Amino acid sequence: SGFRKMAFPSGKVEGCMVQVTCGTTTLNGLWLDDVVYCPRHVICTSEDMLNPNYEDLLIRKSNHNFLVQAGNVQLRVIGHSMQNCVLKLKVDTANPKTPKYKFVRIQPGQTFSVLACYNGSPSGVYQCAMRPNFTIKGSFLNGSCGSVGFNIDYDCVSFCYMHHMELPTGVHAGTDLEGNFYGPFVDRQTAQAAGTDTTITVNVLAWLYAAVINGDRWFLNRFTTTLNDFNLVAMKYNYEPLTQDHVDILGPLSAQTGIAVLDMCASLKELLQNGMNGRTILGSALLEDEFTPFDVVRQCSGV
Amino acid sequence: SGFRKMAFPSGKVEGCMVQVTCGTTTLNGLWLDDVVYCPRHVICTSEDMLNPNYEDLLIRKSNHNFLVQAGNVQLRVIGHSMQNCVLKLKVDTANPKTPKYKFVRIQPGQTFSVLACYNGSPSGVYQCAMRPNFTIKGSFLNGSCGSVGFNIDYDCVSFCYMHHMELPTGVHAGTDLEGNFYGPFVDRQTAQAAGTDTTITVNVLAWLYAAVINGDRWFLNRFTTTLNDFNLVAMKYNYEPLTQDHVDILGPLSAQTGIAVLDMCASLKELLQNGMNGRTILGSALLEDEFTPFDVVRQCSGV
Ligand SMILES: *C(=O)[C@H](C[C@@H]1CCNC1=O)NC(=O)[C@H](CC1CCCCC1)NC(=O)c1cc2ccccc2[nH]1
Ligand SMILES: *C(=O)[C@H](C[C@@H]1CCNC1=O)NC(=O)[C@H](CC1CCCCC1)NC(=O)c1cc2ccccc2[nH]1
């Protein structure tokens, strides 16, 4: 029993983290085979953060301008190139700790683990969701750029996020490992800001199922609703619409608990219209939306 | 910016996890140098869980009754002994991945990271506090026994918890790595249950400071209180008393924010008597008590 925000074990990613320095800027890089991946804004000086032309900035660089350090061993850079908003630094040594890996872009509402790093040294690991507005609510200080987000399946690491910047509201923006930003954000200085966000409905329903599996039942009721009537309520409370595919994805949890999805939707409707009346669910006084149905199944396998 | 429940990177502990089987019972062990540590209840059969005599059960065992597997390599057991509620299985190979380590017993109100494991394979990592009643609110299924809790300081792992059992309320109980239980719990079948718990006041104040550092200020006020008047309120709301040592420990966070500790105590008094009036702090609608002052400083270093 119990239900925690749980990250994947981070050792396979720890063995990939390095430090990259260009000029006076230090951030992290990801070393896989003989390539180190990092944010291209490592090459930007304070004097040209408004409208950097990265193609020009990079043409003016040589391999020796990039200092890469893996633990206390310097890696020699033997090529450099840009891939969208990431740099690829070819080094003369393949990482002996390279795990099986993939580069996968995730969807809003999906979750992943972040290994926060500074100076190429891992500091902490935590779980995050990609919000509907393509930001993440992370925990990142100066120096954390190049830290990555990932999921692990069997022994394969699927990297899905590299950190680039913090927006004015304190949420975070970055790219996939092909260097393409999540959301309408750019690696230059603007007034860019997080757009309106919404709550991830299917995840809230998954977490209510987690709660039932863990013995929290007070929010259940004898009612059911139709999908259309539920989505009218969802729209009123800034929740994403629930689709039949979402209902299908919740099938296993519904079977395990014996509570039909539209029955649980009636509970969620009542929680949105009435609140919790001083009670808690899985130790929270808010409806939690950063657990996917797969996260719940993985963690609450057989109660 | 941002504030997350963050665990320590788990790779140094991943390299220590093994599987231990005795009879039909499989759980996890911790392999350090040439010793594997695991819960002694691995030797208990279903027929003697009410009043096992572990001294007798172990005298009837031989080394070959213990099957230890590290990845897909079997380790040969060459000695066995009991240390309080842990078994020590001497094996014929020193773990080449042994980190620098210590065995440290923690205090209630202290936090640590748990590497949940099954069949000697790490599954997830999360942060936990030792409650005042010496339970932990973990996430553990069948097979998780022998999973450990730890903190990391520089490159030294301080192991502080090994998992043994779940209580009837769904919270968890275990030992330090010397095999001594946290709290009034035993590794035999009884009606034992978690005793009354309380909220960790100094941790709530630390988290309010984290919130201020992260831009949540709505709960601040112009008032201050005395320590005695605050502790009268604490007692009414089942909070631990706040000591002058706690005030001293909060010194750095108070200096960084410019908010005196007894000024923040006045805010906490108002939150306990009035509630939050529909607002949130660091994404929570409850007062959070599983971050220590050190956790806050480590994560919110320089905003
Ligand atoms: C890389 O390590 C950091 C990570 C920041 C630091 C604080 N918290 C984080 O996540 N990235 C930055 O500091 C970027 C660097 C820019 C260089 C030029 C191209 C764009 C990225 N800057 C910011 O994250 C930043 C600047 C800024 C100014 C005003 C409001 C918000 C804001 N965010
Ligand atoms: C080891 O892997 C497990 C971990 C449990 C499983 C479910 N969640 C956990 O944390 N440990 C157990 O199953 C113990 C084994 C006992 C063997 C004999 C000596 C004491 C431990 N049992 C329990 O955790 C347990 C049994 C039980 C019965 C009734 C109410 C609660 C309860 N808890």
Numbering used by the authors:
A (entry chain A), B (entry chain A): 1 to 303
What did the paper state?
The oxygen atom of the aldehyde group also plays a crucial role in stabilizing the conformations of the inhibitor by forming a 2.9-Å hydrogen bond with the backbone of residues Cys145 in the S1′ site. The (S)-γ-lactam ring of 11a at P1 fits well into the S1 site. The oxygen of the (S)-γ-lactam group forms a 2.7-Å hydrogen bond with the side chain of His163. The cyclohexyl moiety of 11a at P2 deeply inserts into the S2 site, stacking with the imidazole ring of His41. The cyclohexyl group is also surrounded by the side chains of Met49, Tyr54, Met165, Asp187 and Arg188, producing extensive hydrophobic interactions. The indole group of 11a at P3 is exposed to solvent (S4 site) and is stabilized by Glu166 through a 2.6-Å hydrogen bond. Interestingly, multiple water molecules (named W1-W6) play an important role in binding 11a. W1 interacts with the amide bonds of 11a through a 2.9-Å hydrogen bond, whereas W2-6 form a number of hydrogen bonds with the aldehyde group of 11a and the residues of Asn142, Gly143, Thr26, Thr25, His41 and Cys44, which contributes to stabilizing 11a in the binding pocket. The results revealed excellent inhibitory potency with IC50 values of 0.053 ± 0.005 μM and 0.040 ± 0.002 μM, for 11a and 11b respectively.
Mpro is a three-domain (domains I to III) cysteine protease involved in most maturation cleavage events within the precursor polyprotein. Active Mpro is a homodimer containing two protomers. The CoV Mpro features a non-canonical Cys-His dyad located in the cleft between domains I and II. The first ORF (ORF 1a/b), about two-third of genome length, directly translates two polyproteins: pp1a and pp1ab, because there is an a-1 frameshift between ORF1a and ORF1b. These polyproteins are processed by a main protease (Mpro), also known as the 3C-like protease (3CLpro), and one or two papain-like proteases (PLPs), into 16 non-structural proteins (nsps).
